[PDB]
Amino acid sequence: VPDYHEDIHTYLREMEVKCKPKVGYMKKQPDITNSMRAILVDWLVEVGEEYKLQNETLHLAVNYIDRFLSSMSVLRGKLQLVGTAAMLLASKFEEIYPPEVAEFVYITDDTYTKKQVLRMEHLVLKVLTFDLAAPTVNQFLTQYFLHQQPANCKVESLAMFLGELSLIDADPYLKYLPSVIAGAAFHLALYTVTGQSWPESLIRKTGYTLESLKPCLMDLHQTYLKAPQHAQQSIREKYKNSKYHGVSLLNPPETLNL
């Protein structure tokens, strides 16, 4: 109901800058690496599928994890604890019926106890100063979707799949803002499926052009081209389902012609 659509888009554009993780934090992490972050992120995708969680919940969890790790040094045996608490907070924030704490303890096949999960919840809240309503790639995509003509269910599902892929690899996606990733994913999806391009109306809305989206887009294209070979595969598996029109098995374009 459009009377606030541009106010909201404006405000989210302001808040993605305030909720952005620190781009070089993994180099300041002694014991964890981009690859250990990918495994965690890939496991969260699975937990979301197991509990039928919203995509938005997963995107928020990741945001919580990247912002926490931007200031808190964490040992590898504790990273999943951080991820479990983050998924707990996200589910509480976003889900109508979030999983109970015991479901979260169980999903870690008792690597951790309830008390540790709950104490970590408290620490994530403290480190993020209770600032949990963060913008995400998903929230931007969903607004961009309104500019299709006509709406195409495959373009939507493919854009969602691409954005999801971007969550897995901190190098390079931490350098890009949610609104920009969403731009790249929408353009890449629209192009793959329909041959069409980033529409003029989204240039007017976002100020983004194909030229400004280029850097993220070349990164996302490569990620799309190499997805069947990546060590993490849960997103590719999830997007084979009919709920997402089987988009993960569409063929990526060989070139983008930009």
Added chain:
Amino acid sequence: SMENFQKVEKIGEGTYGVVYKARNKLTGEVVALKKIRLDTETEGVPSTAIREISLLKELNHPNIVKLLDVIHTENKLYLVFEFLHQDLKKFMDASALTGIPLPLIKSYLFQLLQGLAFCHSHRVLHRDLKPQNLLINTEGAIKLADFGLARAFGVPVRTYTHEVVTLWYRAPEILLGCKYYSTAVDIWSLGCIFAEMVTRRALFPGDSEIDQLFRIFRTLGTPDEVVWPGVTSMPDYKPSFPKWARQDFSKVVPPLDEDGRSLLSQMLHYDPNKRISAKAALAHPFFQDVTKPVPHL
């Protein structure tokens, strides 16, 4: 932690937790303390608290209760808010004889609509507007309070919790089970509150979901496809609903002038798409002479 606060008295119990009036011993500031019982081996920080805190920290506006601080303990969680003097419900009851003068009704409505327009602009739905959650001070202000049922929405909305809004203030799209509801649910509520400030009684005081629907239908007419495209396919719409005629608004809130009735009708439009937005309401002719009378507390 709470060493600087002296509890003065319990205030009430809202969506979650307990609210006390307290005073800051070093500054003199009177505050409202919302105390949250927490624990371990249960669910941890409750979702209502997580949403309330995160959203209120974002929402700084003169017609929105101000969250001043969060004293987050391993035992208890305390939200420190600015203190207001009373709720609208208690004020209406005290104006029982007098009535609330139109200038005050107009100022309060104008202010609430600014508060609401600010929330909606910031992708926040309040979802529990009612006179016990609208708080007034001794300077003519009124503010939205109790954001425990609030949530952040997306554009376009997806399906959110159905069990929302106190019954008497609950929008028809919610009563009829629509899979999508949005900002217009808060406007429906404020429209009922506008009516209630004038008549000093609830507009739609139903005791069940079907009683609530039938009282709305007897006032606004039983809606059909013409008034509200799609209603007859709605999940809890029944073709056996009696078909009441719509009443003339002069009869709905007799003391209201033509501009007032025109605003009220727009805030109670059945089709949530055609229902007026808070932002657009601020520019309604009813507010052309609005001032801010200080209330006779």
